[PDB]
Chain A
Amino acid sequence: QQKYDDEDISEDIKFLLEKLGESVQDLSSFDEYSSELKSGRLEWSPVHKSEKFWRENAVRLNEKNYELLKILTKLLEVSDDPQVLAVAAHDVGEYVRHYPRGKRVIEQLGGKQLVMNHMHHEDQQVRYNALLAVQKLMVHN
């Protein structure tokens, strides 16, 4: 934002910004997310805020036998880490704000009863993410 007359550092910021741009594009992918979720490991990353993975690849979140959603659904009860659980709640919130029949899929999976508990699960970061996910959940409702 603050321009310098140092053309050298100008080109430096240029190539760094573009290179880290394609790097974050490479940290923005469906399959790496599937790998991370299958590893029982979740941490706030560009993947968890990767809007292209969220809106364009939501139909991909309907992976075979809904195993991705099943991993999330079983994490809704076996995940005893508040932060990983928060990430899962946010991801579910996205999957509901994008695809309403996926919403009804989750309703069939019974995740709403588990999520209700997160709306009142000690940690205040857990209240917030449960409330936000359900706020997404209440479209057409």
Chain B
Amino acid sequence: FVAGVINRERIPTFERMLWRVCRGNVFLRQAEIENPLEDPVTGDYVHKSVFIIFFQGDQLKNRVKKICEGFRASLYPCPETPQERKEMASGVNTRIDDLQMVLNQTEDHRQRVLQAAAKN
């Protein structure tokens, strides 16, 4: 029961599909993100809204794996109740900001090199 990533575009109907699998069987985990970054698939900034049906049995878990794979749905996250997961996530996020500034300076080098090359 972990909130995934869906672009709020097929949520009313993906809920219908999750119901046709098992109608109102288990808890629904909800989340929402605004003004998201350019997507890895197309680069769009479509807003995200997600409602997730999850099953603890093995077969039904695999069934929902198949269902979410049959649609554009990302279920990568695997959190954990202890706070250590969130602490490591925050450290990773600091590394993410480091990658961001690294991207900035690499672009700086790229542009200066291109200007040098184009001058001649």
Contact = CB atoms under 8 A, between A and B. Distances in A.
Interface string B20-51: 00000000000000000000000000000000
Contacts of A138: 99, 102
Interface size class of B (residues with CB under 8 A): under 10
Contacts of B106: 131, 135
B99 A131 contact: no
A133 to B, nearest CB: 11
B105 interface: yes
Interface string A128-141: 10010011001001
Interface of A: 116, 119-120, 127-128, 131, 134-135, 138, 141
Contacts of A131: 102, 105-106, 109
8 contacts: A119-B102, A127-B105, A127-B109, A131-B105, A131-B106, A135-B102, A135-B106, A141-B95
Interface of B: 95, 98-99, 102, 105-106, 109
Contacts of B99: 138, 141
A116 B102 CA distance: 9
A138 B92 CA distance: 13
8 cross-chain pairs, A with B, having the tightest CB-CB distances, nearest first: A131-B106, A134-B102, A131-B109, A138-B99, A119-B105, A131-B105, A127-B109, A128-B109
A54 B92 CA distance: 29
